[PDB]
Amino acid sequence: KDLLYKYKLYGDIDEYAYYFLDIDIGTPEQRISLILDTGSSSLSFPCAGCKNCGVHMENPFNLNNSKTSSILYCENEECPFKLNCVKGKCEYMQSYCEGSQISGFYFSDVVSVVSYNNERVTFRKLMGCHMHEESLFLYQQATGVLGMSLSKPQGIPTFVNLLFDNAPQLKQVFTICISENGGELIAGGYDPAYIVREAEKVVWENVTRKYYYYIKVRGLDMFGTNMMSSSKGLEMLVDSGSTFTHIPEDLYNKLNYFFDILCIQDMNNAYDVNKRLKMTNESFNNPLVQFDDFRKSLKSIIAKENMCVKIVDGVQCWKYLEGLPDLFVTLSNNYKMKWQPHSYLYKKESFWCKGIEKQVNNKPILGLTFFKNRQVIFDIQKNRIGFVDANCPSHPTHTR
Ligand SMILES: CN1C(=N)N[C@@]2(c3cc(F)ccc3F)CN(c3ncccc3-c3ccccc3Cl)C[C@H]2C1=O
Ligand SMILES: *[C@@H]1O[C@H](CO)[C@@H](O)[C@H](O)[C@H]1NC(C)=O
Ligand SMILES: *[C@@H]1O[C@H](CO)[C@@H](O)[C@H](O)[C@H]1NC(C)=O
């Protein structure tokens, strides 16, 4: 019942591995597609002149063509926001993967964000110009990154804080609703009409740290058995910019053990099927408090011929969602939030592949495979993040 501004999201888990929206930048407008990333705060892309940039959906943003672009030069060799001064410009630098770096320079210009009901919000933004991209940036279709995290004291004003400072008619809330193909970013609150039904209720979880999107996960259950070797709160970044949900190797190895069992590549191979049916509560090292629920899945995966192909890294893909078990993450109190297979599995070709990976460098992340088929509600002012199952809008990329 609030006032909501809605923006179309494009992408998917398998082909793009992220979700992006379009943004007008400069004067006159240069449309730039940006990866929606709640795990970062910058807004960067390549710029005309880049001598090592990928081929993206748009050309590099052309400063000389924007009547209103202003390169942040360092006078006296001193940059604001404790930035570095290189070759007479305030440096933009990033590190990702294993030492890869995109370097460049900061500049400013007009950014315009329009909803699909034609409501326009404009403001000047500090942004980075990629003059050098590497690794995964050399082969993603999207042109840049739109960081969605909050502004720190005496830091570069971020897109989200500028958006709301220039839209006082909107409550300080934005929702991300991603489906298998494309999604929707909502500014001003969430749409209850997307909530499955009459409409279900939002689960609210306070955020552990301020300025960041961390929440505490105090347990992850499969078949009624917590696979987390600790009930202490595990801080996990609610990150729209990571394709998959990442977890500590202990929790992953204990989950992938039961997914491996449920993965049968040939339903007529006796050794494979025999090896799995000859399993009992006492052969797990982790007895299943709902071992019958486990048996239920296994029998049904063999009954309905839900075959499973393993791909790179030993990631399982099933023919059907039917059979795969629900997962339950434990939040504040003892509230168990259901994590359905249509979220943690993603569509690859015709199968459903596991979208749960090991954490890299003690960085547990609730990624897009946790977003999918939910509304993820960022209540900036109350320092809480909400989750509700929803029929998220869908937008094939041939509608842009
Ligand atoms: C999960 N995750 C992410 N959340 N965002 C990242 C990204 C997202 C994505 F869809 C595709 C490629 C990406 F590089 C980006 N990134 C960052 N992190 C903290 C400050 C800054 C960044 C960052 C901003 C812009 C350009 C390059 C970088 Cl490096 C870290 C990356 C990452 O691994
Ligand atoms: C969540 O935050 C509010 C406001 O700070 C506080 O009153 C409430 O007790 C918190 N709840 C939990 C479970 O931390
Ligand atoms: C399996 O073992 C756990 C723990 O001992 C128990 O709670 C559960 O009921 C057992 N299930 C079966 C089918 O034996």
Residue numbers in the entry: 44 to 240, 272 to 474
The authors write:
A library of known aspartic protease inhibitors was screened to identify compounds that inhibit plasmepsin V from Plasmodium vivax. This screen revealed compounds with an imino‐pyrimidinone‐fused pyrrolidine (IPF) scaffold that exhibited sub‐micromolar inhibitory activity against plasmepsin V. Further screening of IPF analogs against the related aspartic protease plasmepsin X showed inhibitory activity, while a third aspartic protease, plasmepsin IX, was not significantly inhibited.
Modifications to the P1 biaryl region of the IPF scaffold differentially modulated inhibition of both plasmepsin V and X. Notably, analogs with potent plasmepsin X inhibitory activity successfully blocked the growth of Plasmodium falciparum in vitro. X‐ray structures of IPF analogs in complex with plasmepsin V provided insights into their binding mode and revealed avenues to further improve IPF potency and selectivity between plasmepsin V and X. This understanding of how these compounds interact with the active sites of plasmepsin V and X will serve as a foundation for the future design of dual inhibitors targeting these proteases.
